Amino acid sequence: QKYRLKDLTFLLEKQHELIKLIIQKMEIISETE
Amino acid sequence: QKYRLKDLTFLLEKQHELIKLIIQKMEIISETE
Amino acid sequence: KSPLHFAASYGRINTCQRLLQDISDTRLLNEGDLHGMTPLHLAAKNGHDKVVQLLLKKGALFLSDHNGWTALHHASMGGYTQTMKVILDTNLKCTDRLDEDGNTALHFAAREGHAKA
Secondary structure: OHHHHHHHHHHHHHHHHHHHHHHHHOOOOOOOO | OHHHHHHHHHHHHHHHHHHHHHHHHOOOOOOOO | OHHHHHHHHOOOHHHHHHHOOOOOOOOOOOOOOOOOOOHHHHHHHOOOHHHHHHHHOOOOOOOOOOOOOOHHHHHHHHOOHHHHHHHOOOOOOOOOOOOOOOOOHHHHHHHOOOOOO
């Protein structure tokens, strides 16, 4: 289960990177400040 | 592994905050109610 | 009605500012959905303090849904101390409200384990 937990951490970090990319590429028009 | 689990929780909470930001900034035009 | 509930529930603030224009008919502001939750209830449930502040600046009365909860009940169930602090500086009379089972906001904040709340 330690091995499983390490794989989980790796996947979660990849996912976090993808989400940051989404935020930095999206369109923002009506909700701008 | 307790320490690892705590780090996992911290990262997941940061990610949740980012997702809520995405929802509150995005564009919604064709799928509006 | 349907757009305002979504905009308030997900913290989309500019949509709220646009919808709440020509302030004269407060029937839209203080109207709940099918569970009786006004926009204030939703904004506090998801923990969006700016939307709560904006709605209070128009006055939202602190009603109650189909379980007796108030905005403070939801904000405490979630643990969002910031929207709680925003609520606690207005009427200062909702602190000791009771739902259908005589639970206060403190009951929920303690049951869920939110120390700072």
